[PDB]
Design a protein around this nucleic acid. Structure first.
Ligand code: MG
Ligand code: MG
Ligand code: NA
Length: 326
DNA sequence: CGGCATACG
DNA sequence: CGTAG
DNA sequence: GCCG
């Protein structure tokens, strides 16, 4: 088992779902208390379990697995012995965890805002609605649409959304292309938003595109919320039988020179990207982001024509998107 | 022990 | 601060 | 919380 998540295939569905989930609760809780290091270890440990070829049935099968020390091993031990881990259950039940989860789920609310509201004594969505003067415009939208945004989007919904985006993009800039990214590109059948990456085959033609796309979607009556420039975090109106529902959609523009880096980043998973960037810097001495890959010795950027190029330049075996579910 | 990814709105 | 993966 |  390699130590970095970008060195091993991780499928969407696996053989250790219950164990990985328990560890992810502890990761989430660590994030709610600002402990990014502990969050990372519990996430990495969970991801190692997703990468295994069969179920963990005995404690000895953890020996030699990276990111399993005393704490993560104890969690697995208790689950294997009793079907339940007391620490995990205490977190699940806690007022702190439940409220921080509720508040951070709101579009426009992060850990820092959620924590302050918790410390002020706020516990429910209606507590927030009673004091609307304190909310940002973004948080008001997030709270108004919270119910719809809590409901997952299906792949058929995504195909409908892609068509409307493509129409707007075609008017904004003939020849521009729209690529589905995020979890749906990794093979997810459901998800809580939709991500699109937009480019144009002629370098430079994409400059100023996103405002033009947004203005056109606005005029079509499809945009329930947006900020107004290369990333737009929107709430879209999605048709349903006899009605519609609000859906989170992100639109991103990149020049075609940067497209492979943007595609890689926006395809995820989050942990996969963090691990890939960590690997790049710490093992290869190269700096990776969603725009490029920089050699700080030569002071040059690596030209990539494909994701395959990027994996090769980092000395990693290629993983297709459906194996990046770290 | 230091480090933990790296951006844009 | 929020957002993204 | 774990790794190097
Ligand atoms: Mg997504
Ligand atoms: Mg998104
Ligand atoms: Na949030």
């Amino acid at each position: 088992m390699p130590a970095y998540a970008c060195q091993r295939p991780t499928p969407l569905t696996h053989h250790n779902t219950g164990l990985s989930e328990a560890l992810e609760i502890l990761a989430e809780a660590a994030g709610f208390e600002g402990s990014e290091g502990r969050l990372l270890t519990f996430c990495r440990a969970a991801s190692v379990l997703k990468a295994l070829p069969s179920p963990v049935t005995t404690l000895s099968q953890l020996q030699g697995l990276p990111h399993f020390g005393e704490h993560s091993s104890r969690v697995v031990q208790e689950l294997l012995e009793h079907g339940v881990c007391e620490e995990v259950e205490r977190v699940r039940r806690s007022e702190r965890y439940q409220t921080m989860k509720l508040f951070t789920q709101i579009f426009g609310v992060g850990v820092k805002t959620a924590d302050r509201w918790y410390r002020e004594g706020l516990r429910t969505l209606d507590d927030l609605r009673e004091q609307p003067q304190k909310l940002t415009q973004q948080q008001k939208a997030g709270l108004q649409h919270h119910q719809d945004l809590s409901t997952p989007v299906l792949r058929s919904d995504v195909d409908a959304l892609q068509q409307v985006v493509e129409e707007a993009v075609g008017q904004a800039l003939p020849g521009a292309t729209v690529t589905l990214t995020g979890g749906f590109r990794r093979g997810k059948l459901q998800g809580h938003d939709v991500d699109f990456l937009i480019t144009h085959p002629k370098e430079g033609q994409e400059a100023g595109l996103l405002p033009r796309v947004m203005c056109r979607l606005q005029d079509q009556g499809l945009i329930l919320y947006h900020q107004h420039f290369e990333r737009s975090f929107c709430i879209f109106r999605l048709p349903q039988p006899g009605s519609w529902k609000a859906v989170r959609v992100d639109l991103v523009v990149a020049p075609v020179s940067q497209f492979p880096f943007a595609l890689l980043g926006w395809t995820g998973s989050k942990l996969f990207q963090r691990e890939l960037r960590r690997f790049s810097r710490k093992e290869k001495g190269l700096w990776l982001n969603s725009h490029g890959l920089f050699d700080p010795e030569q002071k040059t950027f690596f030209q990539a024509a494909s994701e395959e190029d990027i994996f090769r330049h980092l000395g990693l075996e290629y993983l297709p998107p459906e194996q990046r579910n770290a």
